[PDB]
Ligand binder design. Structure first.
Ligand SMILES: COc1ccc2c(C3CCN(C(=O)c4ccc(OC(F)(F)F)cc4N)CC3)ncnc2c1
Length: 333
């Protein structure tokens, strides 16, 4: 039993006294197909992972009412005091060591997540929650996908609408037909840069301005990347602009830490294949202070998204979610 305090952005998330905990209500959870599918994914992802840098479900409330009348899902989580957006963009400290440590934990979480063939696809400071003990936890897995996706999804083709514009990888923006865990490392690059300057790296107002801002720092993309652009009109737009060499990161962040900018430069690249992985980034000298491979596990077995590729009705998705809630309780008790 619980007692509610105040409404906390993250849907209907309420602060509740029991020690304090977070309770998230998913109202009318089975009314819309896309929403219901998303809840099923999130439940399955968060039950799969067991990692101190990934948000964990602490409890799920079972239906008090009969099955038909079961309309809303209540999920209980550990109360986090803040998120990385609020920390960065406020009056509290954010030294280089804060940056170093927050980056370390994010990458630690991603190594584990990525080894299970799960791409978050929506990493940004507001999805990185921080408790009062400074533990960073990755949340909001609604956008996450595997390496394989069904054509039935609109996002399969319309990749430039995936997730948040300010943190969206070039492969998604330009539809480069290479969608790997590297998607997340671009986003990490953006978060890392944002931590160093305390302002967003690429705050684009629209599709074209977003590409402008990326090019103003990274320069014009290579012919291989340009030809890999699916849309002729985007391809033509890029070819119309004059040539531009990459701006060194030393200039973009004057007086910043050398090893930090070294690591940043290995994240923010146009080509997904060129980017450092989460695992390899943990071995970078910038994170040597915290790095310990024995305390940085992979996830086994891999996560399978097959359940999400099925064309299920609302009622069939409700059934799957209820089976996950039953299973949550059945494993422990
Ligand atoms: C700053 O105050 C806050 C804000 C958000 C908190 C939060 C949110 C952090 C992100 N998050 C989730 O990742 C999430 C978890 C479960 C979920 O249920 C489903 F699996 F059935 F779909 C849906 C979600 N979207 C919402 C909960 N948790 C804990 N404490 C918080 C303190």
């Amino acid at each position: 039993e619980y007692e509610i305090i105040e409404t906390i952005a993250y849907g209907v998330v309420s602060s509740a006294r029991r020690q304090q905990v977070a309770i998230k209500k998913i109202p009318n959870a089975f009314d819309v197909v896309t929403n219901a599918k998303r809840t099923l994914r999130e439940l399955k992802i968060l039950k799969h992972f067991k990692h101190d840098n990934i948000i964990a479900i602490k409890d799920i409330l079972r239906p008090t009412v009969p099955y038909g009348e079961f309309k809303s899902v209540y999920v209980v989580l550990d109360l986090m005091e803040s998120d990385l957006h609020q920390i960065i963009h406020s009056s509290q400290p954010l030294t280089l060591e804060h940056v170093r440590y927050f980056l370390y934990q994010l990458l630690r979480g991603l190594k584990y997540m990525h080894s299970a063939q799960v791409i978050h696809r929506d990493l940004k400071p507001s999805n990185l929650l921080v408790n009062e003990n400074c533990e960073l936890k990755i949340g909001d897995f609604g956008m996450a996908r595997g390496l394989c996706t069904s054509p039935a999804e609109h996002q399969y083709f319309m990749t430039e609408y995936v997730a948040t514009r300010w943190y969206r990888a070039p492969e998604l923006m330009l539809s480069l037909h290479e969608y790997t865990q590297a998607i997340d490392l671009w986003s990490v690059g953006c978060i890392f840069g944002e931590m160093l300057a305390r302002r967003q790296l690429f705050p684009g107002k629209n599709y074209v301005h977003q590409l402008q801002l990326i090019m103003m720092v990274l320069g014009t993309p290579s012919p291989a990347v340009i030809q890999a652009v699916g849309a002729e009109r985007v391809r033509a737009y890029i070819q119309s602009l004059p040539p531009r060499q990459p701006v060194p990161w030393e200039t973009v962040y004057p007086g910043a830490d050398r090893q930090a900018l070294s690591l940043l430069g290995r994240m923010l690249r146009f080509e997904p294949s060129a980017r450092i992985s989460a695992a390899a980034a943990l071995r970078h000298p910038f994170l040597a202070k915290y790095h310990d491979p024995d305390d940085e596990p992979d996830c086994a077995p891999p996560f399978d998204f097959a359940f999400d590729r099925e064309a299920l009705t609302r009622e069939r998705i409700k059934e799957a979610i209820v089976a996950e809630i039953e299973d949550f309780h059945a494993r422990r008790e």
